[PDB]
Amino acid sequence: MKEANHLAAIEIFEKVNASLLPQNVLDLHGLHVDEALEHLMRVLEKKTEEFKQNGGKPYLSVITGRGNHSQGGVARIKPAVIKYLISHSFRFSEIKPGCLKVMLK
Numbered sequence: 001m002k003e004a005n006h007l008a009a010i011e012i013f014e015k016v017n018a019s020l021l022p023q024n025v026l027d028l029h030g031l032h033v034d035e036a037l038e039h040l041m042r043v044l045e046k047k048t049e050e051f052k053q054n055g056g057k058p059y060l061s062v063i064t065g066r067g068n069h070s071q072g073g074v075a076r077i078k079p080a081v082i083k084y085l086i087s088h089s090f091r092f093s094e095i096k097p098g099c100l101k102v103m104l105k
Helices: 004-023 033-053 077-087
Strands: 025-027 059-063 091-094 099-103
Touching (some): 004 033, 033 077, 077 099
Parallel strands (some): 025 059
Antiparallel strands (some): 059 099, 091 099
């Protein structure tokens, strides 16, 4: 699944976020730039709130996918997401291929 990965990504994302959100993980590899951003933005804001209110994780591990380091399919989610973080003055740092770990503010 190179191309089909992008279509499968939606159903994967939905089933996956259920288990991944409590880890403070935002994993949406394969989604469109718009989709990825729209999901990321709403989760990031509510997670910031969960951080300051409920005492969740002080971070969010964003998986855009293994875009660039050891693998590379659709990595344009990464420049898109990066731009979102910087524009809001967030603190992030990539782990390894395409995985941006963001520290909540």
